[PDB]
């Protein structure tokens, strides 16, 4: 009746493994090898260029390690904010109007056979946090990251900082590091945003949260606190609107 | 398999009409010359608990709106004087245009704002608004600021609804209420999230 | 012109009707959609996501991190189960707050299988055996390891497997079952028993933790949508 | 290319309905024998700022008209006496014919003038007038005189609208207002010109 | 006769509907149209017409002939631009009164490229060089010729070319941008700098004038019609 | 539903150059040669006879020149009124009831290499002017023409005499004469009117306006005022309704 | 039965409309027409008839 | 594109065209227009040094200062 169509009478979600869909792309080689085939590809989508690109930024950026003690509650970082001062990727970030990229995050924990515990790594898209009241200073802590807390700006661990229970948090892309089975995790995050490209300096695409599901314990006289290391590699980057300097 | 998953679909889960607002207007007595009331309401889903809570399961969304109006009236005093039939103007102001500030004003004249003229006692009025937005989808959660060293989590703009009574004052004051029933249509969602508890919810992601 | 007759049910508004309506902003071009990655097309796709079961809703360990852990200590046991969980996905306080519970809370009839997973978060040098038993509907829960051994059970060996999976099938006289019901007191149970003690090599701590996750299989379904959320005071 | 120029088209830019006039009539009391009022209005676009300003972008034009009438009524005094339903006569006098001068007159009889009889409380009345003109297009600007050694800039003739109430006087005086909504259709324009500022405009090209 | 049911939305007048109506003057023959030369079929065809930019809306030289000219005198310069113009086609007072501005003032969303042209109206015997630089969105305007030289710029040689053209492309995260917005303070700038002084051979006057014109390219578009004109007092 | 169709539910603008569309018509030869190929054809339409013609009127009519000084504000003429006393074209104009024709206007400026300035020539269809209050005496000044003015009958220069800003005036067919680039302009005006033919004695089809965009300046001791000359040639004329005398 | 929506312009009488109407005397046979000689099909056929011009409308 | 048709009347020093090292930035390919200098009726001459003259011109200078050989 009417030509305008406003009224006409009317496996890929559960953190797919790399080998399932894309196995011909072990180009990651060289911070780890043979663990790239047990990685999770978020939403079963591989980062890709904008269809109908720097080389230095392809490298890995190993942030500082953090100490998992018998008291820690959790840690979190923001992407791309966490890489706002890492060499040429940060340079490009600050001297362009628009930019886009995916990420590859590798988390590692150095532990002996006499340590026990479990960690969960979650990749929240548009991770709007909240404390217990925000400013630009709180939502962007930099590579230093921030720390959750139990019962400054420190969200609540069991609510994930946004009012939703921690147990349900497994809807987000996630992985589990159980010290007695494996001690490495890998997430391949594609570009997620309502716009096809956006200003990096103002908008954080992703947030990364690490929470201890089972506390740390160890045999007597061992190391009382173990280190956790993050390694982030941008993928398929591209920027437009280059300014001077 | 004699069981279907067609009742949990997104369209089935969302596309259901529910009342979102009640707007009060009136036609005053012709003796007392107080201003004739008119109603203005900005379209937003952050006042209906059920629709919002069902939307916060996700982060990005797209949908059209279907709006229906149920009008009722009543005399507000025991007088033998009566009134003739009443006609109501229901103006939709798209996102970005001025809002009326007085009952008589050029805003109820602009060819840009589409209006409906509804005569009391007939079938309810209905319209459909398409997906109006500058991005490629609505965003219930937005980790960003407008200005960098500013509001933390963008807000969605849908339009405005204004309502008045075209008839000039009678010798009898008659008060009317319009109930708006909204129905999302052709809806799509992305990137599921955990749901929040019933803690009165909140204005933002704050709790 | 054309003769016509008006049937009953005209000039009425039914809030569940599907009629074409007049567009208010014709000659308007909408922003085309882009290929955003994670698209959800059915709400059952969200019920098939494993989420942790809060095992201790006791006021002491309520709304914290301790309510998701089950502790295995060194003290002697009394042949009673480590944990016993009912199979009311929307009528058990310890199972209604999961994603499955919150999707079932929006409907009236449900039907399908479930799957539980238990994960052992102890040391790599520990060894032992646990017995995971399933009691079908209409049978009261078992109370001793021998009773559970004679039913349907699996022996999970802590020492060569870190996670144990158990699929509960669909049993009912009717094709559907009510999410919220009273006097049922059935649906079965899942219980965990100490088949064997836990042995450690050295000063290794003797207190372990286990976690649990619940999910719905690919034959689950719901119907008769019902919503009761209200913030009224 | 995923962007279309179909919203700046001439039809989209012009073909939108806007109120052009409000015509007042009334049915007086049967006791006082004062004359029954009737309304007369000559069709012209030089009283609506928006339509005119959008037309002055060009010099030659062609279009049909679509006219809709929204009628409202009210009692004008507190009396228990009431009135029955009212019927309105809405007569269109084409360009060149006599105009009514009294409420009862042969002009509300001529078979040449088409009329509409509208009963209060039903859907609004509507008609469509074609392109009526002796030239091949309307001219918003005309550099010419009627008599050479006379008016400087021809004027366009569209017709006249007359309105009255067929019912004979009741014992109660009831006043009615009719709002006319005009919509140009199948419009074409020629020879663009610069637009004028908002200086109340003017009756001619004078400023 | 035929059974029928009346849906909601009947006996209502929507001012945006497209229905057939009864003709009032049937059996009437209309004057046929003739082939008048200049036919306009879209309002974007009017935005692609170059029109002079009023560069001096100062009260002194306001609403006269002096507001369209930029004067190049012989006095020493301070390395500051001759003229700097923002790229808000409907939010800059010096650019909103052009034909492009007046077509944008009738809509809400706009998107496309722009093109500027500068014309030198000095003597035939003058020589020199000017630097025309474009600052992209999100960057504050340059303040020295060296800063502008390191960006995107063109050297216009007064002496062998009388007019210089510069096309500003379309950059935005969204597919459309709002005509009227606040707090944006972006869109870029176009600046003109003295790369070199102006040399004259003889008593030739040392004061020149330059004019500017702005237009929209063949990929411009607008939508969401909005009109706010009113003579109310 | 209804047979009467009153209700059924429903490059050439920017002053084209001659070579674009019609290049096989350099019949203009002989007031100028090789400048006929850089002329603008208004609305991209060539004057043509009335499809399903005097010879003397084909000539050019060189009106008097006008002096561009360092103070002039502008000049304007009306067509066909400007040619109401030029020989046989005027004779035909006054002794017929109906007539039609296009025009070709050639504007020239005599300047040396030490003069500077810029002129704009605009061809307004139905150029209804207005002063600051008209009669038949004001709208028809004859071949003498009229003069604009700044802050008798003298419209306002920056409003073009009709209330619209001068900057937008470039919507009309136009040309620019910049003394340092060229000093000649040519406009080929077709017949524009709502009627297929009309009485010339009462109706002015076109108006021609000349406005100084940049004032005149020159080297010391030069000529303090330069001449501007107009040359008008009717094209494809034809008249009907011949009276006596 | 069939869903329908009532547009503006319904239940109005326009004196220039062309709609089918119900017959009042069905089952009635009309007298057939005969071939009368002088049939007029257009009013311009009457304007093409020469008629004398009154040249002296003077009161006398 | 700073000049055209004057590139064919240029001198190639020692008749050798610059070439890569046989058996490469893009931004540095641009032209760098230094400040102009005023030739009066008294000037005696001017001189510059290469590559020193370009020690602060954007990415070419950046590469100059952050490499060992070039």
- Provide DSSP, D6-29: TTSBHHHHH---EEEEEEEEEE-B
Q: Do E5 and G4 touch (CB under 8 A)?
A: yes
Top residue of C22, C27, C36 to mutate, by most chain B CBs within 10 Å, is C36
Residue (of B144, E151, B156, E89) closest to A199 by Cα position: B144
CA separation (Å) from A112 to A115, A225, A227, C122? 6, 11, 11, 13
Structure determined by:
cryo-EM
CA gap A237, F135 in Å, rounded: 72
Q: CB–CB of G5/E9 below 8 Å?
A: yes
CA gap D116, D105 in Å, rounded: 17
CA gap E139, H50 in Å, rounded: 32
Token duo for residue H53: 């003259």
Q: Is the dihedral of CA F178, F182, F183, F189 positive or negative?
A: negative
A198 in reach of chain E (CB within 8 A): yes
CA gap B202, A164 in Å, rounded: 13
Q: Do C21 and E10 touch (CB under 8 A)?
A: no
Residue B48's CB: how many other CB atoms inside 10 A? 16
Query: Which DSSP letter does residue E48 get?
Result: T
Q: CB–CB of A176/A120 below 8 Å?
A: yes
Residue D9's CB: how many other CB atoms inside 10 A? 16
Instruction: Give residue B46's region: left, alpha or beta (phi > 0; psi -120 to 50).
Output: alpha
CA separation (Å) from E214 to C77, E53, E115? 88, 7, 6
Residue (of E15, D16, B92, B67) closest to C21 by Cα position: B67
Q: Which helix (H) or strand (E) covers residue E110, if one does?
A: strand E109-111
Cis peptide before F80 (omega within 30 of 0): yes
Q: Do D4 and E33 touch (CB under 8 A)?
A: no
Beta bridge partner(s), residue F41: F188
> With contacts defined as CB-CB under 8 Å, which chain E residues touch C28?
223-224
Least Cα separation, residue C28 to chain D (angstroms): 6
Q: Is the dihedral of CA E97, E99, E102, E108 positive or negative?
A: negative
Top residue of G4, G8, G17, G18 to mutate, by most chain D CBs within 10 Å, is G8
Q: CB–CB of B179/B102 below 8 Å?
A: no
Write out chain F in H/E/C secondary structure: CCCCCCCCCCCCCCCCEHHHHCCCCCCCCCCCCCCHHHCEEHHHCCCCCCCCCCCHHHCCEECCCEEECCCCCCEEEEECHHHCCCHHHHHHHHCCCEEEEEEEEEEEECCCCCEEEEEEEEEEECCCCCCCCCCHHHHCCHHHCECCECCCCCCEHHHCCCCCCCHHHHHCCEEEEECCCCCEEEEEECCCCCCCCECCCCECCEEEEEEEEEEEEECCCCCCCEEEEEEEEEEEEEEECCCCC
Pairing state of beta strands D115-119 and E163-168? Answer: unpaired
Residues whose CB is less than 8 angstroms from the CB of residue F31 and which lie 6 or more positions away in sequence, other chains included: F60, F62, F106, F231
Q: CB–CB of B182/B15 below 8 Å?
A: no
Phi, psi angle pair for E52, to nearest 5°: -65, 140
Q: CB–CB of F238/F191 below 8 Å?
A: no
Residue linked to tokens 């609208």: D161
Q: CB–CB of A66/A145 below 8 Å?
A: yes
Token duo for residue H34: 């230094």
CA gap C12, C9 in Å, rounded: 6
Beta bridge partner(s), residue C111: C221
Estimate to the nearest angstrom the gap between the alpha carbon of A136 and the chain centroid.
Answer: 20
Instruction: Give residue F87's region: left, alpha or beta (phi > 0; psi -120 to 50).
Output: left
Residue A78's CB: how many other CB atoms inside 10 A? 24
B146 in reach of chain D (CB within 8 A): no
List residues of chain E with CB under 8 Å from any CB of chain C. Answer: 1-10, 14, 16-18, 174-176, 223-224
* 3-state secondary structure at position A44: helix
Residue (of B118, F3, B22, H58) closest to D121 by Cα position: B118
CA gap D156, D129 in Å, rounded: 15
Residue F171's CB: how many other CB atoms inside 10 A? 22
Residue (of C184, C198, C167) closest to C72 by Cα position: C198
Q: Do A240 and E171 touch (CB under 8 A)?
A: yes
Q: Do chains F and H touch (3 or more CB pairs under 8 A)?
A: no
CA gap D87, D71 in Å, rounded: 11
> With contacts defined as CB-CB under 8 Å, which chain D residues touch F10?
185-186
Helix-strand-coil split of chain B, %, nearest 5: 5, 35, 55
> With contacts defined as CB-CB under 8 Å, which chain E residues touch G15?
none
Q: Is the dihedral of CA A31, A36, A38, A40 positive or negative?
A: positive
Tally the residues of chain D: 207
Cβ within 8 Å of D, F 71-110: 78
D202 in reach of chain E (CB within 8 A): no
Least Cα separation, residue C25 to chain E (angstroms): 8
CA gap G46, C47 in Å, rounded: 88
Burial class of G23 by CB neighbour count within 10 A (0 to 12, 13 to 18, 19+):
exposed
Radius of gyration of chain H (CA): 16
CA gap E133, E144 in Å, rounded: 11
> With contacts defined as CB-CB under 8 Å, which chain C residues touch G7?
none
Q: Do C4 and G4 touch (CB under 8 A)?
A: yes
D8 in reach of chain C (CB within 8 A): no
Q: Do E16 and B114 touch (CB under 8 A)?
A: yes
Angle at E181 between CA E177 and CA E185, to 5 degrees: 95
| CB nearest to D126's CB, from G8, G13, G16 | G8
CA gap F107, F103 in Å, rounded: 13
Residue C202's CB: how many other CB atoms inside 10 A? 9
Q: Which helix (H) or strand (E) covers residue E164, if one does?
A: strand E163-168
Query: Which DSSP letter does residue H58 get?
Result: H
Residue (of F193, F203, F62, F208) closest to F124 by Cα position: F208
Token duo for residue C61: 């360990």
CA gap F119, F214 in Å, rounded: 7
Residue (of E184, E43, E188, E178) closest to E114 by Cα position: E188
CA gap C215, C45 in Å, rounded: 11
Chain C: partners with 3+ C-beta pairs within 8 Å: A, B, D, E, G
Token duo for residue E123: 């003597």
Tally the residues of chain H: 70
- Sequence-ordered strand ranges (E) for chain D: 18-27, 39-42, 60-75, 87-93, 115-119, 125-129, 138-139, 160-165, 174-190
D7 in reach of chain E (CB within 8 A): yes
CA gap B51, B14 in Å, rounded: 8
Q: Do E155 and H58 touch (CB under 8 A)?
A: no
Largest CA distance in chain E: 99
CA gap B192, A125 in Å, rounded: 10
* 3-state secondary structure at position E147: helix
Q: Do E8 and B97 touch (CB under 8 A)?
A: no
Phi, psi angle pair for F35, to nearest 5°: -95, -5
A154 in reach of chain B (CB within 8 A): no
| CB nearest to F4's CB, from E23, E97, E208 | E23
Least Cα separation, residue E12 to chain B (angstroms): 5
The CA-based dihedral angle spanning residues A158, A162, A168, A173, taken in that order and rounded to the nearest 10 degrees: -110
CA gap A169, A160 in Å, rounded: 8
| CB nearest to F116's CB, from E21, E51, E121 | E121
CA gap F163, E70 in Å, rounded: 24
Residues whose CB is less than 8 angstroms from the CB of residue F24 and which lie 6 or more positions away in sequence, other chains included: none
Breaks following residues of chain D (C-to-N distance > 2.5 Å): 149, 153
* 3-state secondary structure at position D49: helix
Least Cα separation, residue C39 to chain E (angstroms): 21
Q: CB–CB of C74/C206 below 8 Å?
A: yes
Token duo for residue A43: 């939403």
Top residue of C18, C31, C32, C33 to mutate, by most chain E CBs within 10 Å, is C31
Chain A: partners with 3+ C-beta pairs within 8 Å: B, C, E
Phi, psi angle pair for A138, to nearest 5°: -80, -45
| CB nearest to E39's CB, from D2, D7, D190 | D190
Chain H: partners with 3+ C-beta pairs within 8 Å: E
* 3-state secondary structure at position B3: coil
CA gap D170, C206 in Å, rounded: 101
Token duo for residue D201: 């405009």
Least Cα separation, residue B13 to chain D (angstroms): 31
Residue C14's CB: how many other CB atoms inside 10 A? 11
CA gap B56, B140 in Å, rounded: 7
Phi, psi angle pair for D11, to nearest 5°: -60, -45
Least Cα separation, residue E164 to chain C (angstroms): 35
Residue linked to tokens 């009726």: H41
* 3-state secondary structure at position D181: strand
Q: For D41-156, where are the alpha helices, taking DSSP H only?
A: 49-55
> With contacts defined as CB-CB under 8 Å, which chain B residues touch A163?
196-197, 199, 202, 205, 207
Residue A131's CB: how many other CB atoms inside 10 A? 15
Chain F: partners with 3+ C-beta pairs within 8 Å: D, E
Q: CB–CB of E20/F1 below 8 Å?
A: yes
Chain G: partners with 3+ C-beta pairs within 8 Å: C, D, E
Token duo for residue D20: 């052009």
Q: For chain H, where are the alpha helices, taking DSSP H only?
A: 58-65
Q: CB–CB of H59/H68 below 8 Å?
A: no
> With contacts defined as CB-CB under 8 Å, which chain E residues touch C22?
9, 14, 16-17
Write out chain C in H/E/C secondary structure: CCCEEECCCCCCCCCCCCCCCCECCCCCCCCCCCCCCCEECECCCCCCCCEECCCCCCCCCCCCCHHHCEEECCCCCCCCCCEEEECCCCCCCCCCCCHHHHHHCCCCEEECCEEEEEEECCCCCCEEEEEEEEECCCCCCCCCHHHHHCCEEEEEEECCCCEEEEEECCCCCCCCEECCCCCCCCCCEEEEEECCCCECCCCCCCCEEEEEEEEECCCCEEECCCCCCCCCC
| CB nearest to C49's CB, from A4, A14, A114 | A14
Residue (of G4, A198, D62) closest to E171 by Cα position: A198
Residues whose CB is less than 8 angstroms from the CB of residue E203 and which lie 6 or more positions away in sequence, other chains included: F219, F220
Token duo for residue F89: 């074209």
Estimate to the nearest angstrom the gap between the alpha carbon of C118 and the chain centroid.
Answer: 13
Angle at D93 between CA D92 and CA D96, to 5 degrees: 155
CA separation (Å) from A114 to A227, C71, C155, H50? 15, 19, 25, 65
| CB nearest to F43's CB, from E37, E68, E208 | E37
CA gap B165, B36 in Å, rounded: 9
Beta bridge partner(s), residue B128: B66, C23
């Amino acid at each position: 009746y009417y030509r305008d169509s406003a009224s006409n009478a009317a496996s890929k979600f559960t953190e797919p493994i790399k080998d399932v869909l894309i196995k011909t792309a072990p180009m990651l080689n060289t911070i780890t090898a043979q663990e790239a085939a047990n990685s999770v590809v978020a939403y079963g989508r591989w980062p890709e260029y904008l269809r109908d690109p720097e080389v230095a930024a392809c490298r890995f950026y190993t942030l500082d390690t953090v100490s998992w003690t018998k008291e820690s509650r959790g840690w979190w970082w923001k992407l791309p904010d966490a890489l706002r001062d890492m060499g040429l990727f940060g340079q490009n970030m600050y001297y362009h109007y628009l930019g886009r990229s995916g990420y590859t995050v590798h988390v590692q924990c150095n532990a002996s056979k006499f340590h026990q515990g479990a960690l969960g790594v979650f990749a929240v898209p548009e991770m709007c946090l909240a404390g217990d009241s925000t400013s630009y200073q709180n939502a962007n802590p930099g590579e230093k990251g921030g720390t959750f807390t139990g019962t400054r700006f420190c969200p609540v661990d069991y609510l994930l900082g946004n009012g939703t229970l921690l147990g349900n948090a497994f809807v987000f892309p996630h992985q589990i590091i159980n010290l007695r089975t494996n001690n490495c995790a890998t997430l391949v995050l594609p570009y997620v945003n309502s716009l096809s490209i956006d200003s990096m300096v103002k908008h954080n695409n992703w947030g990364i949260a690490i929470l201890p599901l089972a506390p740390l314990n160890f045999a007597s006289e061992s190391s009382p606190e173990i280190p956790i290391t993050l390694t982030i590699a941008p993928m398929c980057c591209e920027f437009n609107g280059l300014r001077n300097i | 398999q004699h069981r279907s998953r067609s009742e949990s679909s997104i369209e089935s889960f969302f596309a259901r009409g529910a009342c979102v607002t009640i707007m009060t207007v009136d036609n005053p007595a012709s003796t007392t010359n107080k201003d004739k009331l008119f109603a203005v309401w900005k379209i937003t889903y952050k006042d209906t608990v059920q629709l919002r809570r069902k939307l916060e399961f996700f982060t990005y969304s797209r949908f059209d709106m279907e709006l229906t109006f149920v009008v009722t009236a009543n005399f507000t005093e025991t007088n033998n004087g009566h009134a003739l039939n009443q006609v109501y103007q229901i103006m939709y102001v798209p996102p970005g245009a001025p809002v009326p500030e007085k009952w008589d004003d050029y805003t109820w004249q602009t060819s840009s704002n589409p209006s409906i003229f509804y005569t009391y006692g007939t079938a309810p009025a209905r319209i459909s608004v398409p997906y109006v937005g500058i991005s490629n989808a609505y965003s219930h959660f937005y980790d960003g600021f407008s200005k960098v060293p500013s509001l933390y989590g963008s807000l969605n703009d849908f339009g405005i609804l204004a309502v008045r009574v075209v008839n000039d004052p009678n010798p009898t004051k008659v008060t009317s209420k319009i109930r708006v029933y909204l129905k999302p249509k052709h809806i799509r969602v992305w990137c599921p999230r955990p749901p929040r508890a019933v803690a009165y919810y909140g204005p933002g992601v704050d709790y | 012109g054309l003769p016509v007759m008006n049937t009953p049910g005209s000039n009425q508004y039914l809030t569940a009707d599907n009629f074409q309506s007049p567009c208010a902003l014709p000659e308007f071009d909408v922003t085309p959609p882009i290929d955003i990655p994670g698209e959800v097309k059915n709400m059952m796709e969200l019920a098939e996501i494993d989420t942790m079961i809060p095992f201790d809703l006791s006021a002491t360990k309520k709304n914290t991190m301790e309510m998701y852990r089950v502790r295995l200590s060194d003290k002697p046991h009394t042949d009673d189960p480590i944990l016993c969980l009912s199979l009311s996905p929307a009528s058990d306080p310890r199972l209604s707050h999961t994603m499955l519970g919150e999707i079932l809370n929006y409907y009236t009839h449900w039907a399908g299988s479930l799957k539980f997973t238990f994960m052992f978060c102890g040391s790599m040098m520990a060894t032992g055996k646990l017995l995971v038993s399933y009691a079908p509907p209409g049978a009261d829960p078992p109370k001793k390891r021998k009773e559970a051994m004679l039913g349907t059970h699996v022996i999970w060996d802590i020492g060569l497997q870190s996670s144990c999976t158990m699929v509960v099938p669909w049993i009912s006289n009717t094709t559907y079952r009510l999410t919220i019901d009273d006097s049922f007191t059935e649906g079965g149970y899942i219980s965990v028993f100490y088949q064997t003690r836990i042995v450690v090599p050295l000063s290794t701590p003797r207190e372990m933790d286990i976690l649990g996750f619940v999910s719905a299989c690919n034959d689950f379904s719901v119907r008769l949508l019902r919503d009761t959320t209200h913030i009224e005071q």
